[PDB]
Design an enzyme around this catalytic site. Structure first.
Site, PDB file in Angstrom:
ATOM      1  N   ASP B  35      95.158 111.631  74.414  1.00 18.21           N
ATOM      2  CA  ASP B  35      95.994 111.927  73.246  1.00 18.21           C
ATOM      3  C   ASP B  35      95.337 112.076  71.896  1.00 18.21           C
ATOM      4  O   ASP B  35      95.004 111.045  71.307  1.00 18.21           O
ATOM      5  CB  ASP B  35      97.016 110.756  73.198  1.00 18.21           C
ATOM      6  N   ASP B 218      98.010 118.132  68.705  1.00 13.43           N
ATOM      7  CA  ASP B 218      98.366 116.934  69.486  1.00 13.43           C
ATOM      8  C   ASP B 218      98.423 117.214  70.983  1.00 13.43           C
ATOM      9  O   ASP B 218      99.431 117.726  71.478  1.00 13.43           O
ATOM     10  CB  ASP B 218      99.690 116.392  68.896  1.00 13.43           C
TER      11      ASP B 218
END
Lengths: 5, 325
Positions: B35, B218
């Site tokens: 992430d 992201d």
């Protein structure tokens, strides 16, 4: 769906 | 795989991408979601009382390099999912790179969505200014300071389930077989701890659907989430209809759609027609773009699975090129 902060 | 190379698994229809990380001595393999939108490394543990029976759990008792820590942690992601627990220290092996004494966060509690997903935890690749506990050095910080990478970068390839899935992260290098043409350098704004960029404009055919807007890269977000006005503008270009929940219903037939093109630092990057559809359920298709109430966009997997990105934490900056496909 994901939504990582 | 080469040094620092981590093959990824594409979960479902490009929902997320996870890789195997070995933690402890002798060590167990964990599936972590990579992430770039967060900076905490947390994993399910045997201290957890509401974790999934399917998750692999870190057991302090089975690691001879476990070191206790008196601090606690708690996190809450963009979608409200959360987890909490205690800090610890142990060794982490990332693609053959052994990070010694990494701060790891053991979950004592996690949201049901984590209990039922494919992840054993998350590996945060955002900047250290957003770790939930002050003073925690992130895995990238440690790869650099321990001399495990000679360039402060990671190359990211996310595959498409339609083409077989997969993906690959390379810590300390990149792979030119995964992209076409020349990489474009784009400056990063890390003032909020994220990989922030500015998109010059967005077009669909000849129509300018959006002027410049900021967004964050992201990998931990499935869709392309746009500020309300921009999302509506895009939706009008494709005839998509608002589901009232942040998502749109779009035609399952994308053969007639033009690509969503982003102009970034003078080059064109797109969301291909096929990527405009996220999922199909009993003949209704959910679009690959959604809306949120933020003034910046969340540039998630919908966009990243179409564009290779080299993340440079040192400058900071990113290098992007269209995926080779």
């Amino acid at each position: 769906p994901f939504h990582x902060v | 795989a080469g040094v620092g190379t981590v093959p990824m698994t594409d979960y479902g229809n490009d929902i997320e991408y996870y890789g195997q990380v070995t933690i402890g001595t002798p060590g167990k393999k964990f599936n972590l979601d990579f992430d770039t939108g967060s900076s905490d490394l947390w994993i399910a543990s045997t201290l957890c009382t509401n974790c999934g029976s399917g998750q692999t759990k870190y057991d302090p008792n089975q690691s001879s390099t476990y070191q206790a820590d008196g601090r606690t942690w708690s996190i809450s992601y963009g979608d409200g999912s959360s987890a909490s627990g205690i800090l610890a220290k142990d060794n982490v092996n990332l693609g053959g790179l052994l990070i010694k004494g990494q701060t790891i966060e053991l979950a004592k509690r996690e949201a049901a969505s984590f209990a039922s997903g494919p992840n054993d935890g998350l590996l945060g690749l955002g900047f250290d200014t957003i770790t939930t506990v002050r003073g925690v050095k992130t895995p990238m910080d440690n790869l650099i300071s321990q001399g495990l990478i000679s360039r402060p970068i990671f190359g990211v390839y996310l595959g498409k389930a339609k083409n077989g899935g997969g993906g690959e992260y390379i810590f300390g290098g990149y792979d030119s077989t995964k992209f076409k043409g020349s990489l474009t350098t784009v400056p990063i704004d890390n003032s909020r701890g994220w990989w922030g960029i500015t998109v010059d404009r967005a077009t669909v055919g000849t129509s300018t659907v959006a002027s410049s807007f900021d967004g964050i890269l992201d990998t931990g977000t499935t869709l392309l989430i746009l500020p309300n006005n921009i999302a509506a503008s895009v939706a009008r270009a494709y005839g998509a209809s608002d589901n009232g929940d942040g998502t749109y219903t779009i035609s399952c037939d994308t053969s007639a759609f033009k690509p969503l093109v982003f102009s970034i630092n003078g080059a064109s990057f797109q969301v291909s027609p096929d990527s405009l559809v996220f999922e199909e359920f009993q003949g209704q298709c959910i679009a690959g773009f959604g809306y949120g109430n933020w003034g910046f966009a969340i540039i998630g997997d919908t966009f990243l699975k179409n564009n290779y990105v080299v993340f440079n934490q040192g400058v900071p900056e990113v290098q992007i090129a269209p995926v080779a496909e």
